[PDB]
Each structure stands twice: as structure tokens, then as C-alpha cells.
Amino acid sequence: SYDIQAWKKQCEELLNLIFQCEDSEPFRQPVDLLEYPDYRDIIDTPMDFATVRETLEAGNYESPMELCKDVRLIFSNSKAYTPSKRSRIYSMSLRLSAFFEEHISSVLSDYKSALRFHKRN
């Protein structure tokens, strides 16, 4: 399965699944400062799933590793901003992260395998 470009549609489909998950609700759009005026004192690099989808659709990811780094930043931002490990929105982040990691593993493996095959000779 050595298609170097296949990751992009596989990532589009995974983002559609994440948007169908009720657990993605807090993460579908950039955090609103009006609600959380201290957010940028704690979070240097806001990230959300709509920004990830737009970056992919613009052709501004070169690899699924770059997309994975931005999705992981959504989850690390949540873990940093939560006052409790027993918070609703944080607990939503942890279930969504497990779902994402379970599905991205094959996308990353197939891509890196395809690139190694491209450089075989």
C-alpha cells in the first residue's frame, strides 16, 4: 500500500468522524476569549479542529505528522487550561484523544512505509 498521497483523504475522513463525536463539541472552533479572558496568558498557541481542517484543505500540511502535531496541541491546550483532572471539557478531551490516536496510527504507518518504498533504490 505505497500511495504517498493517501494520508490526505484518510485525514479528511477521520476529521469527519471527529466532527460527528459529541466529545468534539468544545474543540470544533477556536476558544472564545470573551468567555475565557485569561486564555492567552496560559495558552501561547490556540488550536481547534476547524483550523486543522482548513489547513489540510488549503494544502498547507506536507505530511500526516504535521496534522498529528496540531491535533495533539488541541489536547495539550485542554490539559493545561483545566483546573481539575475531573473537569467535563478535559474528560471530553481525553476520550477524543484516545479515539484520534486509535485511528491515526495506521495513517502514519502507511505514509512512512510509502516514503521508505519511494526511497528503496
Ligand SMILES: CC(C)NC(=O)N1CCN(C(=O)c2cccs2)CC1
Ligand atoms: C469553542 C469553544 C466551545 N471552546 C471553548 O470555549 N473551550 C473549549 C476548550 N477549553 C478547554 O479545554 C477547557 C475548559 C475548561 C477546562 S479545559 C476552553 C473552553
